[PDB]
Write a protein that binds this ligand. Structure first.
Ligand code: HEM
Length: 153
């Protein structure tokens, strides 16, 4: 996938994200639901969190956003060989939650967005290109794994 000098850009940011992972994680979930309300339907647990304000104030939502980013970071860190980290993610998203590859792309777009919003002097063109290509490789590999579980995407 990526060249070392892209991974360098990816890891470069990521280090700047971890100090506030929790905050980032929650903004990504809230933004997902608010820009794409269909995704909210896949979370039985957040079903009731109807207004925005009930989202901003859920500590389940923050906890789950933190969980989403944590796994991402683990996978970004393995750089190009991240199969042992993806597999369990692919399995649950395919056989359990049943998440389309399109929703995957939706969240990847927001992750990039949230980072840019939060790190204006550091998240530049180059880093943005590289981040995208990293999330794109993740999306692909997820989609591929999905097939081994009989799920389409
Ligand atoms: C690429 C970003 C994503 C990552 C890194 C991520 C990862 C997480 C992790 C670590 C879990 C819990 C462990 C597991 O069940 O495997 C979680 C739960 C789950 N994920 Fe994701 N996820 C991704 C995107 C998506 C998207 C776009 C959706 C669609 C709305 C989604 C919906 C869910 C659901 C429904 C659960 C169940 C939560 C619960 O049991 O209440 N995920 N995911």
């Amino acid at each position: 996938g990526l060249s070392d000098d892209e991974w360098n850009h990816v890891l470069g940011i990521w280090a700047k994200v971890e100090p506030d992972l929790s905050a980032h994680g929650q903004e990504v979930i809230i933004r997902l639901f608010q820009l794409h309300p269909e995704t909210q339907e896949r979370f039985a647990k957040f079903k009731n969190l109807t207004t925005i304000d009930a989202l901003k104030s859920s500590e389940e939502v923050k906890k789950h956003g933190t969980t989403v980013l944590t796994a991402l970071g683990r996978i970004l860190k393995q750089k190009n060989n991240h199969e042992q980290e993806l597999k369990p993610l692919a399995e649950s998203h395919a056989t359990k939650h049943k998440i389309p590859v399109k929703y995957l792309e939706f969240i990847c777009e927001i992750i990039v967005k949230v980072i840019a919003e939060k790190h204006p002097s550091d998240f530049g063109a180059d880093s943005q290109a590289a981040m995208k290509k990293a999330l794109e490789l993740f999306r692909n590999d997820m989609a591929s794994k999905y097939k081994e579980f009989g799920f389409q995407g």
